[PDB]
């Protein structure tokens, strides 16, 4: 039975976000209407059913650009991408509906569950 390091996973994630912030080894650009966001495909797959289903497929494995659905709110996507890399979700009454629709599209069931609880507690 192995020694558990309770802070390790959070430390790795912090460093993955630092790599994203310095554009180190990012391998995809997500185009959301007039905005673009660079990221690591590995993190996108790890956090989203949509990105998992795209990049596990050898047909799409090597794509360097992904164009999201035209109606996806870029603010909602930006908040979710930050969530992926930080474990912190920037939810408020002013963005709840946009964040919820985007998380349903991205297939992020725990975030959708949290959005539903935010509405229930409102
Ligand atoms: N190699 C690999 C690899 C990389 N990413 N990834 C994911 N990503 C994934 C897929 C879907 C969702 C989310 C993440 C976020 C929440 C959501 O609504 N959907 C899942 C996964 N597995 C393997 C067993 C079943 C599943 C995990 C499980 O459902 O218990 N394998 C991998
Ligand atoms: Cl989730």
From Swiss-Prot:
Query: What disease does the Swiss-Prot or TrEMBL record associate with this chain?
Result: Chromosomal aberrations involving BCL6 are a cause of B-cell non-Hodgkin lymphomas (B-cell NHL), including diffuse large B-cell lymphoma and follicular lymphoma. Approximately 40% of diffuse large B-cell lymphomas and 5 to 10% of follicular lymphomas are associated with chromosomal translocations that deregulate expression of BCL6 by juxtaposing heterologous promoters to the BCL6 coding domain. Translocation t(3;14)(q27;q32). Translocation t(3;22)(q27;q11) with immunoglobulin gene regions. Translocation t(3;7)(q27;p12) with IKZF1 gene 5'non-coding region.
This protein's name: B-cell lymphoma 6 protein
PTM summary from the entry reads: Phosphorylated by ATM in response to genotoxic stress. Phosphorylation induces its degradation by ubiquitin/proteasome pathway.
Q: BTB domain spans which residues?
A: 26-93
Effect upon mutating residue 15 to K: Abolishes interaction with NCOR2 and HDAC2, no effect on interaction with CTBP1 and transcriptional autoinhibition
Q: What does this protein do?
A: Transcriptional repressor mainly required for germinal center (GC) formation and antibody affinity maturation which has different mechanisms of action specific to the lineage and biological functions. Forms complexes with different corepressors and histone deacetylases to repress the transcriptional expression of different subsets of target genes. Represses its target genes by binding directly to the DNA sequence 5'-TTCCTAGAA-3' (BCL6-binding site) or indirectly by repressing the transcriptional activity of transcription factors.
Name where it's found: Nucleus
Its tissue distribution reads: Expressed in germinal center T- and B-cells and in primary immature dendritic cells.
Q: Which domain of life is it from?
A: Eukaryota
Q: Which residues of the intact protein are shown?
A: 7 to 128 of 706
Effect caused by changing residue 53 to A: Abolished ubiquitination by the SCF(FBXL17) complex
Q: How does it assemble?
A: Homodimer. Interacts (via BTB domain) with the corepressors BCOR, NCOR1 and SMRT/NCOR2; the interactions are direct. Forms preferably ternary complexes with BCOR and SMRT/NCOR2 on target gene promoters but, on enhancer elements, interacts with SMRT/NCOR2 and HDAC3 to repress proximal gene expression. Interacts with histone deacetylases HDAC2, HDAC5 and HDAC9 (via the catalytic domain). Interacts with ZBTB7 and BCL6B. Interacts with SCF(FBXO11) complex; the interaction is independent of phosphorylation and promotes ubiquitination.
> In the UniProt entry, what is the domain comment?
The BTB domain mediates homodimerization. Its dimer interface mediates peptide binding such as to corepressors BCOR and NCOR2. Interaction with corepressors through the BTB domain is needed to facilitate the rapid proliferation and survival of GC B-cells but is not involved in the T(FH) formation and BCL6-mediated suppression of T(H)2 and T(H)17 differentiationrequired for GC formation.
Q: What is the induction note for this entry?
A: Down-regulated during maturation of dendritic cells by selective stimuli such as bacterial lipopolysaccharides (LPS), CD40LG and zymosan. Protein levels decreases upon genotoxic stress in a dose- and time-dependent way.
